[PDB]
Scaffold this active site. Structure first.
Site, PDB file in Angstrom:
ATOM      1  CB  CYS A   1     -14.207  24.561  20.383  1.00  0.00           C
ATOM      2  SG  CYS A   1     -14.054  26.341  20.050  1.00  0.00           S
ATOM      3  CD  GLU A   2     -14.701  26.507  13.175  1.00  0.00           C
ATOM      4  OE1 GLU A   2     -15.258  27.612  12.980  1.00  0.00           O
ATOM      5  OE2 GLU A   2     -14.602  25.623  12.293  1.00  0.00           O
ATOM      6  CG  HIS A   3     -13.480  29.907  17.209  1.00  0.00           C
ATOM      7  ND1 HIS A   3     -14.672  30.378  17.703  1.00  0.00           N
ATOM      8  CD2 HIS A   3     -13.500  29.996  15.855  1.00  0.00           C
ATOM      9  CE1 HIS A   3     -15.387  30.726  16.647  1.00  0.00           C
ATOM     10  NE2 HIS A   3     -14.719  30.522  15.513  1.00  0.00           N
ATOM     11  CG  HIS A   4     -10.169  28.812  21.762  1.00  0.00           C
ATOM     12  ND1 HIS A   4     -11.540  29.005  21.758  1.00  0.00           N
ATOM     13  CD2 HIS A   4      -9.560  30.014  21.888  1.00  0.00           C
ATOM     14  CE1 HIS A   4     -11.720  30.312  21.864  1.00  0.00           C
ATOM     15  NE2 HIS A   4     -10.558  30.960  21.949  1.00  0.00           N
TER      16      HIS A   4
ATOM     17  CD  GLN B   1     -23.598  24.290  21.464  1.00  0.00           C
ATOM     18  OE1 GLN B   1     -22.653  24.400  22.240  1.00  0.00           O
ATOM     19  NE2 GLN B   1     -24.846  24.380  21.867  1.00  0.00           N
TER      20      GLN B   1
ATOM     21  CG  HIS C   1     -18.325  25.453  24.334  1.00  0.00           C
ATOM     22  ND1 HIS C   1     -17.891  25.484  23.026  1.00  0.00           N
ATOM     23  CD2 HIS C   1     -19.660  25.226  24.351  1.00  0.00           C
ATOM     24  CE1 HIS C   1     -18.975  25.303  22.285  1.00  0.00           C
ATOM     25  NE2 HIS C   1     -20.064  25.145  23.044  1.00  0.00           N
TER      26      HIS C   1
ATOM     27  CB  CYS D   1     -12.337  27.533  25.437  1.00  0.00           C
ATOM     28  SG  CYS D   1     -13.820  27.801  24.431  1.00  0.00           S
TER      29      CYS D   1
HETATM   30 ZN   LIG Z   1     -13.291  27.975  22.009  1.00  0.00          ZN
END
Ligand SMILES: [Zn+2]
Ligand SMILES: NC1=NC(=O)C2=NC(=O)SC2=N1
Ligand SMILES: NC1=NC(=O)C2=NC(=O)SC2=N1
Ligand SMILES: NC1=NC(=O)C2=NC(=O)SC2=N1
Ligand SMILES: NC1=NC(=O)C2=NC(=O)SC2=N1
Ligand SMILES: [Zn+2]
Ligand SMILES: [Zn+2]
Ligand SMILES: [Zn+2]
Ligand SMILES: [Zn+2]
Ligand SMILES: [Zn+2]
Ligand SMILES: [Zn+2]
Ligand SMILES: [Zn+2]
Ligand SMILES: [Zn+2]
Ligand SMILES: [Zn+2]
Lengths: 167, 181, 180, 173, 120, 120, 180, 173, 167, 181
Positions: free
Chosen positions: F22-25, F63, F91, F93
């Site tokens: 996951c790029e965000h976290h 995703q 996920h 996260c």
């Molecule tokens: Zn995330």
């Protein structure tokens, strides 16, 4: 043993008996669907009993979930299930041992013992364990039988490990 | 129909034929395990074919009720035991019945007796499926009937299905029945 | 060990043999679906036997860690793919491993590498089971090792119980129940 | 023919011996001694299908038929199940015949899509029914992780009538 | 956190969600913790048992160490007859099952057999 | 990678394991991809379909983007009547289900209904 | 919103009321097991109602992302814990959310924060369902929103289908089947 | 007594009204108007157990008895199942009586370990059997994630005989 | 409706009939285990039929897996299962509606309709749907019945959503 | 035993009592759904109690076989339907049987008939459990017998168990039986 010529000689005799059964049940043996039934029922019964003519490392080896089809000797109705074996021979001939004894008029306890004694006599191992779980159509209840020989009967650890390794 | 007088008369005839079969197979009919097998095999075969003794007209006596219902009625997972007419070997499975009534409904125990009358005979799964569907249709005269039989006779299940009336014609009706079972 | 130089050298030899097999089976090796089959079959066979390229001691490099022994350690449901040495047909299964450390533990990824080195070879299930158990024993020198391999060539289940797992009924029973 | 099989068996064994050497193995070790012949017999067995040939109102389905085939791209097996369905016109498919149809086509170097179509066309030619449906679900050992490939061929009323098509797909679940 | 009950029988808290980081590769490993203890007449509050799991799981860890730390923390807090901790986790650098048995859980075979069966 | 078969019927490859970041976290997300397509007489090799999933899943992703990329790659490689890609993932996260339907999979309701039922 | 200053100020007020309740029930608040219950019960009630502390717009901060709309996006099996406003007793369940974006997607963790803001309040399941759906609609402005909440107070299942999910039978059917 | 319940009901409602204000809510809004009384009645109901009182050769087990109780630490429910087992001496536990025993003790501010022991001691005092076994498995809402707490109390032959103890634990699975 | 005094008056009459049944079955009504059976069977039958004396937002609300116990009117043998309801009223009184109709001598199709009509008459909603799935002891086969009223009968989308939301 | 002559004689007596019950409950016995209920309820009660018609001695005729077997035999998941003797309401479940033979074994169909003879009566689960165990013990005289009955009569299952011989005495024997079922 019942030779191939015994089978060919008794086939019309079995068909004649099945024709008699069709009439005794109240059916019309002349209707299209029943016309060949005396011969088909005879061939099926000969196939279910073909075992009468037949004859033949520091780890536990187990072959589980072996499909098994036998005939109940009390009612001539099939009983179907699985055989689990423990004990060096491969899947082939192990399957042959199962089929020699299962393709007969049997009782599950006898079939179980014959499989364990056949493996013992063929391999001469430290031990052998055989568990048969089957559904009897002569009665969905499962019948479970077991026979332990050698270290499988004598050593509790060996016996317990085999019984756990089926799941 | 096959009466109980017929059953008692034909029992020695069946036992005599099973004795003959034991000898023809290479077995000794005198051994303990086989001694009573002619009679036990005969009684078992009589039991698997006891549907010949019954009549659809007799089963349908006091079977229909006026309920003012016009929505789908389903009876699923009805245990079914039958005889293959080709080899005289049993076949076992389940029956799932569905119908859309025209105000008249069939008593649950009578629906089970319809399945029993036809299944306890020498059969072919496709015929058994159609007979149950035709019996319900003739008894209730409903908007539609659906009958699905799944049975074990290589290893695999045989599924047969008879869809009549709104069950054949309306896609939504058929889809609902098949999803609910 | 089998080097990558060996792989590139033997690839045309394997492809030539697969071309021969296609002809012997009655097939036309020129049809679209078979055109690259000699090379694809050769690469697949090389992949299924890549464990010959590795040695037991190179995966044991930076694999052992000093921990004050967390009693029984189990890694269950390890996917395994191997080659039957009798017919050159694959067999697929799972490996369940357990050990009682003598203040020395094995890294999880290194345990998976032990399974891979021996499984990616022409094998017999009984031998593969014993090799995994012997490799863990030689790497950690633990109180005991238990290795259970269940595969489809109906399933065959093989097991090797070394040391404590052979002698003590309680430790063997605890291992076999925990791998459910 | 069987004459071809006996003639090509030593040729197949010789090629498997060559493979055993090219992989880095010792073909003289006890466990490998008979492997060229065993591998050759197995490959002949997996391809024996090349040798082989040939009043109702209800859908008939035979589901969960075990199937074993060979990927023609990599020569690695693909194992699964075949689900067959048909709407008969006076003729019903015998269970032994249905099994032989699945065997004739599965015992070849295949692509799942082709195997699916061949089974459907064979049932159509044997029974001449209102329609046929065949669904094959299999695990390919080429992909080596446990992905299933599902293919289907719908002929006759199974392609034309959506209700028929949908009933077959629901009943094979 | 500690309460006095007239209790000398096995107390189990199973299926406690656990989220930890693998120190070797800096990738997470997620699972469950199963705790069991035989009290010496005094019990631990359920929320406090969850906080013990949280203090050690929310760190750079090795599953074997995390299992031992939870067991040692319960032993030091309650001083019971025995403690058992089983951790089952999926490592993202790939189930791994680890266990620490202390006191009667290590010594008495009947006690550990009962704990291991009750957590299934 | 492309093969000519006399095939115009739905081909599905379901339960393809997928491992992405996951790029965000910067935390991983693991799941399955379900691919379906209606070929224009030509099919894609199974191993090549797995490589398409691998090229896009082994990156810093979202995703929804990963699902679209796999679908667009199959469309551009085969030029079929339609493509459907469903990704179901957990996920770290935190199941998240995303889907991209192209061609007959977007236009024909019967075609998408069949694909979605066959992947269960 | 409810600040942390409000929480510390109201904690003795809540504890005093819980002390009163223990006496009214017939209990002895001095017994060991009840000694700290006024404070523990007060902290638990504050935790189960911490959604009053947050506003809809502060979780919408850095929550929307511009993507070229990956058609239906679903987040299913989101654990939910709420408080029944009728009896002040908890109700536990799952939330299944789906939306069809208009080239604007919501971050996964922010979707979970929307469920938390409304669930951690004195609620009625029907209201909680509508609030989650309205919050997603106001944040993304999508073609449609579907929110299904299944809870145990036998289960109650509530659902809010906005826009496309209400009008089109196919999109609603696809959503309801995918949340299995 | 019931006189105590009617007297304390307005006192409980007044305390719940105070809670509604301390949480930041408006107790005058329609949905909250009757909440003080509804919460008070619910709490009285969850604690009604304070008011209440009171030839064989086979193990008898009653498993999967639904149980609902209150955590005395946080005043939040804990819900689960009770599994009871006994070896009778001339007396058999009536199903209605067994349910009332579970209810008398579960409808209180409890700790799972205490609730478990009380049920076991009540069955022992009612039947005077060779032994008793009680296992409680419950989810505590204090822990707020879905962890089960399992407690057990074994009396008589259930504590002394390992075979008896083991049979009860296997049969309740 | 059958008042409480009707119940107290008919209790000895029901016990007398159950005593008669014990004798007709071949049992000895004087044996300890049967001594109180005439009264216990009578009280049970009165309890199973107590429903005779009884009488009484922009989202779909469903209450599924509601346990249901009824008596088959054809054989006086119980039928047990679940009721699933869709349509503002809470779990209480909704349970009361189920119990008023289920505690009678019933047929599943009638019980299903009465529940949907009672909810419609109590709430006057846009629509109501009731699905009953039960095991009949008068025959493990499940019988599934359904009744849709209002928008649940008229709108296919509403009907389809309700049927999917049970799983 | 209860003969078929007794059944035909007592059928109008049972129907008359069920007619009386319908009237006492507040129902109209003339309504379509109730018209044949007196007879159907009477036949159902006769069927649930048909075990009174059989005898353990008759069931045990040609039931024992000398198999030279001394290892555990288990028959699990035997469906069981019975009548509660306290309220005359059915109770349903399963029976799991296990025995260690002293060379003699019991025919599978005969084991099912033992369960049927005692279950089709007015019963108490503990008595039914003991009767099956005592019947097997008296017929085979084995090293041990184990019988477990699990049944549904609040919502929960009742489990009863009778352990005799090596099943009571040997911990390993008892553990093996309980795990295998
Ligand atoms: Zn995330
Ligand atoms: N797995 C295993 N189990 C045994 O019980 C055993 N006994 C032996 O002698 S070698 C061996 N291996
Ligand atoms: N079961 C069934 N399904 C069909 O779709 C059908 N179509 C027909 O013409 S006959 C028939 N039977
Ligand atoms: N089933 C059973 N299990 C025991 O442990 C027992 N002990 C006894 O004294 S009587 C009995 N029956
Ligand atoms: N969830 C939902 N489903 C419907 O079918 C519906 N119809 C309406 O009018 S409001 C509504 N909500
Ligand atoms: Zn038999
Ligand atoms: Zn057949
Ligand atoms: Zn092999
Ligand atoms: Zn391939
Ligand atoms: Zn790591
Ligand atoms: Zn509530
Ligand atoms: Zn607590
Ligand atoms: Zn009935
Ligand atoms: Zn009862």
């Amino acid at each position: 043993p019942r030779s191939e010529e015994d089978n060919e000689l008794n086939l019309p005799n079995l068909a004649a008996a099945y024709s008699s059964i069709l009439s005794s049940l109240g059916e019309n043996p002349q209707r299209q669907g029943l016309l060949k039934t005396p011969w088909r029922a005879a061939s099926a019964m000969q196939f279910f009993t073909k075992g009468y003519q037949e004859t033949i490392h520091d780890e536990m080896v187990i072959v589980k979930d072996i499909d098994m089809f036998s005939m109940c000797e009390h009612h001539l109705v099939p009983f179907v299930g699985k055989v689990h074996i423990g004990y060096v021979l491969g899947l082939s001939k192990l399957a042959r041992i199962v089929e020699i004894y299962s393709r007969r008029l049997q009782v599950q306890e006898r079939l179980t013992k014959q499989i364990a004694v056949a493996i013992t006599e063929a391999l001469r191992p430290a031990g052998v364990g055989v568990v048969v779980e089957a559904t009897h159509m002569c009665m969905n209840s499962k019948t479970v039988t077991s026979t332990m020989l050698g270290v499988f009967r004598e050593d509790p650890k060996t016996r317990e490990e085999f019984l756990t390794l089926i799941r």
